[PDB]
Structure to design on (911 residues):
């Protein structure tokens, strides 16, 4: 039962730094090679960094070479990613994965991911605006200009669920997030 | 560098079908190619290694083939767990790279989008900005062209699109296009339209309003 | 089962060949040799021959005798010429290292 | 009769001292020379006989598994500088069978086999010293590798090292042993296999290469072979020497293993006689009158020395005749002339090359020849030892009265 649990991550600014932690358990950590992979929002998987068993051998993708630092701590069976000098296009999910060179079997096991996003923005609460309908019909809400990221559909408290659609937030040119949530309700209310 | 190119990028499939995703290498990579499955929001889990070795725990529906440059993943009868996106990844160069992906989504009959239009709300007006929303509700074939017209002027570069994943009960998509203008640029035109095009519509359907 | 032949009386400067009948028990794959028995003195080593056929001799005999074998017929052969008072002896053969009981020999005196 | 001359000589101090110095010469001739020592050749012949036996049959010997004779799912343990098929390594990589009799050899036994074989081959290569020498050392180094998932034949528990990745362990239990463990990662630069593996290096310093030390290693080699008794499968060259049987157990060579085991037993006792010769040095002489009944206390020791030398020579002859192929029959002769006394290299002693398998490569013929040559050149020395044995014994009896 190989297991990789990830911590840290969070919200960075352009320039400056974040850190990623990956704590391994259920295998002999100092015999396997490890790799950091990241996935931008709509995109594919990019291998960022590889570190050997001993932790003395280190390889980086051009996209990140002189800007991050991979390290491992074989006594507490932990792997670390030091993201200095940050840029907006490093916004992605970050994955630590075990490379299985004994079997020759690729990325055997992966962590759950931890979220990274960098923006000049500062935490602002949403502004919710009614989407009333005109003369079955549909209405909803519009949560606009926020930066936290996690927002909750709240407008029913557990009543109506089969007609709600909350849309994936979208990053506006302002550095703020916008989202709409629509409902199919009757024709009279 | 070695670039892996998958084909197709997307696929609509059915439970009980035989699905085939191919993958191609720029250079010869011998047999060092793996396949991963990735379901929304979670990490990819490995399915196939060495081009043809079925990672343990993985059901036998899955299977690999190929050598050198042209490789192929096969699922012999799609099951509900299998709807996800699939990546090939080569283990031959100094740093491994993946393919762009193949999304397999559940196929379904054609359904027209029932189109709704929503005007700006009084509060947002005297704050300085305006947001016009266009809802496309429960359509299927996914390809959609949504164009904005104000006073019949084709608008560009100021609307942004966002689509849900297939409905867990309907297998249908839902799209929200949002047009943002300043309040200054907003109170000078009167007609606001949203024009939807789709296989499910004989004629493009338009929902509009006036100030 | 080991005995000799060809020993006899000859003048100084003469010739004669001496022959040793050994069984393969002694012979096959074993080094063979020839020995002296003079009155009043002990058994002295004379010559030897390897299964592979390498000869070598003693100084009292250097340059005069020639030892030979027959791997088909388990036979040892010694040719003696240029005889001296010192060849007065009973001549015996044996394997090297020796078997405990010896043959009877043949008398050569000069 | 010849007993008249024996007493006439037994009371002549010139005739006795001549024999005593004859004994020092033949003693030093036996235990201080090499080229010219039947004893030396016979110890060498025993050693090289064992060594050659494994060179002939190792490549065909089945071995595999995990740590304590346990079956393995996917283990490949490769020992270096071993006579493999087409190779200078042997590859134990048999899976899903537990090692044992008439089956694959455990990695636990192959380690004992291998270490003794490496110590021998190095020692042979340096050159066995004269039997007088007991202070010779040899440094020995050998490596093996482990690859494949779940192979624990290289773990910190197998090797005893502080950590499999980069660790080291040193032992001084009298002789120093350093073990060191190195992991090569699947994606390491230079890694041709593209598979992680573990290389173990063993460095032994101060290993004795005396006759008894090396004759003991030869016994570890042949006895591990015979006791594990693994299954084997020969691959006869087409048009080369044919082996029989083609498959079976290594014990199935009862004729060959016995011959080698007695040759080792004979040379061990042969070596055990050197201590006798050393303790009865025959160099002091023995101006006054001399009568046997009173001043002849050297007789016991002069007899012990001469008799030791004689048994050493007879044992030397026995070692050779246990293996001399002219005296062998049937399969055992087939084994010896076709394989054991051959070298398929393209070759100093202890040289493992890709073609060493299925041939002895232990100079077995040349040592058999060198043994014969030595004995034919012991003609004078041998008579003089018995002549000295006859004199010393007649003086032991005069001394009793």
């Amino acid at each position: 039962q190989v297991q990789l649990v990830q911590s840290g991550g969070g919200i960075g600014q352009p320039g400056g730094s974040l850190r990623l932690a990956c704590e391994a358990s259920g295998f002999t950590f100092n015999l396997f090679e490890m790799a950091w992979v990241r996935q931008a929002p709509g995109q594919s998987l990019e291998v960022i960094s590889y570190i050997g068993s001993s932790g003395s051998t280190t390889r980086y993708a051009d996209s990140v070479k002189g800007r991050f630092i991979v390290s491992r701590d074989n006594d507490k069976e932990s792997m670390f990613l030091q993201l200095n000098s940050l840029r907006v296009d490093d916004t992605a999910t970050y994955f630590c994965a075990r490379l299985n060179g004994w079997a020759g079997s690729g990325l055997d096991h992966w962590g759950q991911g931890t979220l990274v996003a960098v923006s000049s923005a500062s935490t602002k609460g949403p502004s919710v605006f009614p989407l009333a309908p005109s003369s079955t019909a549909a209405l909803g809400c519009l949560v606009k200009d926020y930066f936290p990221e996690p927002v909750t559909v709240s407008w029913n408290s557990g009543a109506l669920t089969s007609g709600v659609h909350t849309f994936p937030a979208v990053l506006q040119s302002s550095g703020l997030y916008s989202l709409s949530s629509v409902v199919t309700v009757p024709s009279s209310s | 560098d070695i670039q892996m190119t998958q084909s197709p990028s997307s696929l609509s499939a059915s439970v009980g079908d035989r699905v085939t995703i191919t993958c191609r290498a720029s250079q010869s990579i011998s047999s060092y190619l793996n396949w991963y499955q990735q379901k929304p929001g979670k990490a990819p889990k490995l399915l196939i290694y060495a081009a043809s070795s079925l990672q343990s725990g993985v059901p036998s529906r899955f299977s690999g083939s190929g050598s050198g440059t042209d490789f192929t993943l096969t699922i012999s009868s799609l099951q509900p767990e299998d709807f996800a996106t699939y990546y090939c990844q080569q283990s031959y160069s100094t740093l491994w790279t993946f393919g762009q992906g193949t999304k397999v989504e559940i196929k379904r009959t054609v359904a027209a989008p029932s189109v709704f239009i929503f005007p700006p709300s009084d509060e947002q007006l005297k704050s300085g900005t305006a947001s016009v929303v266009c809802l496309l509700n429960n359509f299927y074939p996914r390809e959609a062209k949504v164009q904005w017209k104000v006073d019949n002027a084709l608008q560009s570069g100021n609307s942004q699109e966002s689509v849900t994943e297939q409905d867990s009960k309907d297998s249908t998509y839902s799209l929200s296009s949002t047009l943002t203008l300043s309040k200054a640029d907003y109170e000078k035109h009167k007609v606001y339209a949203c024009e939807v095009t789709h296989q499910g519509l004989s004629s493009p359907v338009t929902k509009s309003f006036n100030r | 089962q080991l005995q000799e032949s060809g020993g006899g009386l000859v003048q100084p400067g003469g010739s004669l060949r001496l022959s040793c009948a050994a069984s393969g028990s002694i012979f096959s794959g074993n080094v063979m040799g020839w020995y002296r028995q003079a009155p009043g003195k002990l058994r002295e080593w004379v010559a030897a021959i390897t299964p592979q056929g390498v000869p070598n001799y003693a100084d009292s005999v250097k340059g005069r005798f020639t030892i030979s074998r027959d791997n088909a017929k388990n036979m040892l052969y010694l040719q003696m010429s240029s005889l001296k008072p010192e060849d007065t002896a009973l001549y015996y053969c044996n394997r090297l290292p020796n078997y405990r009981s010896w043959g009877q020999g043949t008398q050569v005196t000069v | 009769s010849t007993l008249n001359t024996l007493i006439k000589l037994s009371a002549d101090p010139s005739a006795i001292n001549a024999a005593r110095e004859n004994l020092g010469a033949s003693a030093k001739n036996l235990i201080g020379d090499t080229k010219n020592s039947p004893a030396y050749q016979a110890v060498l012949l025993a050693i090289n006989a064992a060594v050659g036996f494994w060179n002939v049959l190792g490549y065909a010997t089945q071995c595999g598994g995990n740590a304590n004779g346990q079956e393995s799912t996917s283990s490949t343990t490769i020992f270096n500088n071993e006579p493999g098929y087409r190779s200078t390594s042997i590859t134990c990589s048999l899976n899903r069978y537990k090692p044992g009799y008439y089956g694959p050899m455990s990695i636990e036994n192959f380690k004992k086999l291998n270490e003794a074989y490496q110590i021998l081959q190095t020692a042979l290569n340096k050159g066995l010293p004269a039997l007088k020498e007991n202070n010779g050392t040899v440094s020995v180094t050998y490596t093996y590798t482990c690859s494949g998932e779940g192979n624990d034949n290289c773990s910190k528990k197998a090797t005893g090292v502080s950590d499999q990745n980069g660790g080291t362990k040193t032992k001084t239990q009298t002789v120093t042993t350093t073990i060191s463990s190195k992991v090569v990662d699947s994606q390491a630069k230079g890694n041709t296999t593209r598979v992680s593996y573990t290389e173990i290096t063993n460095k032994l310093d101060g290993v004795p290469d005396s006759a008894q030390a090396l004759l003991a290693q030869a016994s570890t080699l042949i006895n591990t072979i015979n006791t594990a008794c693994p299954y084997f499968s020969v691959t006869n060259k087409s048009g080369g020497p044919q082996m029989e049987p083609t498959r079976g157990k290594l014990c199935g060579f009862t004729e060959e293993i016995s011959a080698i085991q007695k040759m080792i037993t004979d040379a061990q006792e042969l070596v055990n006689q050197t201590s006798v010769i050393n303790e009865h040095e025959q160099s002091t002489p023995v101006g006054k009158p001399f009568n046997p009944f009173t001043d002849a206390s050297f007789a016991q020791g002069m007899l012990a020395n001469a008799s030791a030398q004689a048994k050493m020579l007879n044992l030397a002859h026995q070692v050779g005749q246990t293996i001399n192929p002219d005296n062998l029959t049937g399969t055992f002769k087939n084994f010896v002339t076709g394989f054991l006394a051959t070298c398929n290299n393209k070759s100093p002693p202890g040289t493992v090359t890709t073609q060493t398998f299925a041939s002895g490569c232990a100079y077995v013929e040349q040592t058999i020849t060198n043994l014969n040559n030595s004995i034919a050149h012991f003609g004078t020395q041998e008579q003089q030892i018995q002549q000295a044995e006859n004199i010393a014994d007649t003086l032991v009896n005069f001394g009793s009265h």
Helices of chain B lie at 122-125, 183-186. Residues 122-125 of chain B form the longest helix (4 residues). The domain at 4-106 of chain B is CATH 2.60.40.10 (Immunoglobulin-like).
